[PDB]
Amino acid sequence: NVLTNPDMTAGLDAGHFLSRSGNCKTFDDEADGYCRGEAVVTLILKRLPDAQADKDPIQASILGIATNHSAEAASITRPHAGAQQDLFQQVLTETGL
Amino acid sequence: VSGTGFGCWLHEAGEFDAAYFNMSPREAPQVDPAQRLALLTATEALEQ
Amino acid sequence: IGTVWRDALKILSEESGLTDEELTDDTSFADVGVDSLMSLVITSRLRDELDIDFPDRALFEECQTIFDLRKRFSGS
């Protein structure tokens, strides 16, 4: 994510997505939007037995992953807590934890 | 400035049924015709 | 209330791009296509110009149809 198009910022502010005060203040009582950031990240993945047999350095293991949609939200952009709870429960049960 | 101006075009790319898809006359022209055509074709395929 | 209601209906028709022929009492805000995103613009313009009190809840949530919006505007 590299931001260089002013139109994207203008259109995100026209949609009341971005805060006009400062950074993202999550859990704060005065949260009024998010801030646009940049970052590039790359990871190397491999099945655990293949990494162990290769003497590769391992620093974490992914146990499960899932995706769904909040299609029951009041609006397209608005989130839906029920869908998120179902996703979390599904991943937890599948992972066995 | 391009050197070629040919291509095969969709001449009904701007046609949409806003009322069917709970859209508004001011919102509709702001939606990329790709999304509108995707909606139309997906609905037709599902009904077919 | 009459002048405020007429100006509000004009504002709603402008932002929605509808006629005021079909933006009647029976009209449902969902069928019109007003999201929370658009209701925010409606309420912001409304407060800025007409000076009416529609904070923190927009219109589509509490007011399902034009009936509810008109009732809220009447200040009954």
Side-chain angles (χ1 to χ4, degrees):
Chain A
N1 193 242
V2 312
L3 326 163
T4 293
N5 203 341
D7 280 20
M8 241 59 54
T9 320
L12 277 155
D13 186 49
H16 306 115
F17 289 106
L18 316 185
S19 85
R20 286 169 187 215
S21 68
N23 210 319
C24 317
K25 43 200 78 87
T26 129
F27 306 123
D28 188 349
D29 197 273
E30 277 192 299
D32 43 70
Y34 79 81
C35 208
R36 292 189 94 211
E38 295 182 325
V40 192
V41 191
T42 315
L43 330 172
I44 307 293
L45 304 170
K46 178 133 56 156
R47 289 184 299 271
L48 192 64
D50 303 335
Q52 279 175 327
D54 265 13
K55 309 230 217 303
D56 272 308
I58 305 158
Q59 51 203 59
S61 298
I62 292 160
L63 299 179
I65 187 143
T67 303
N68 77 352
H69 211 84
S70 41
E72 305 291 1
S75 151
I76 186 158
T77 50
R78 180 169 275 186
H80 188 56
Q84 303 171 350
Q85 182 164 348
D86 296 55
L87 186 57
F88 300 158
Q89 190 58 249
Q90 187 213 127
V91 171
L92 266 183
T93 57
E94 152 208 281
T95 297
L97 296 159
Chain B
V1 161
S2 170
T4 182
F6 294 101
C8 320
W9 319 86
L10 267 39
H11 293 291
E12 290 103 46
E15 307 285 341
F16 192 47
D17 190 357
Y20 186 102
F21 293 102
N22 303 327
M23 201 144 306
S24 88
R26 200 176 146 140
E27 163 174 16
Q30 301 223 247
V31 184
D32 191 348
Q35 305 182 11
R36 297 185 249 150
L37 290 185
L39 266 178
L40 288 166
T41 58
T43 321
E44 283 184 321
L46 280 158
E47 160 152 299
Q48 153 174 345
Chain C
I1 286 146
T3 206
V4 179
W5 174 237
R6 148 194 316 91
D7 292 351
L9 193 84
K10 150 159 90 64
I11 289 291
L12 191 79
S13 83
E14 271 128 11
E15 295 293 357
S16 266
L18 300 214
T19 49
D20 79 354
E21 161 41 285
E22 193 38 301
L23 267 180
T24 85
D25 202 69
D26 205 2
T27 304
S28 161
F29 279 104
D31 304 348
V32 160
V34 317
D35 321 64
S36 89
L37 185 62
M38 169 195 187
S39 68
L40 287 164
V41 182
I42 269 64
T43 51
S44 301
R45 208 185 209 81
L46 199 95
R47 177 208 313 276
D48 160 352
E49 274 140 29
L50 286 115
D51 229 20
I52 324 308
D53 46 6
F54 256 29
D56 312 301
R57 332 153 298 261
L59 33 159
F60 86 102
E61 149 181 5
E62 68 223 337
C63 298
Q64 324 276 3
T65 175
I66 309 307
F67 204 133
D68 282 51
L69 178 56
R70 101 185 208 240
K71 206 191 281 236
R72 291 289 227 141
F73 259 135
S74 197
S76 294

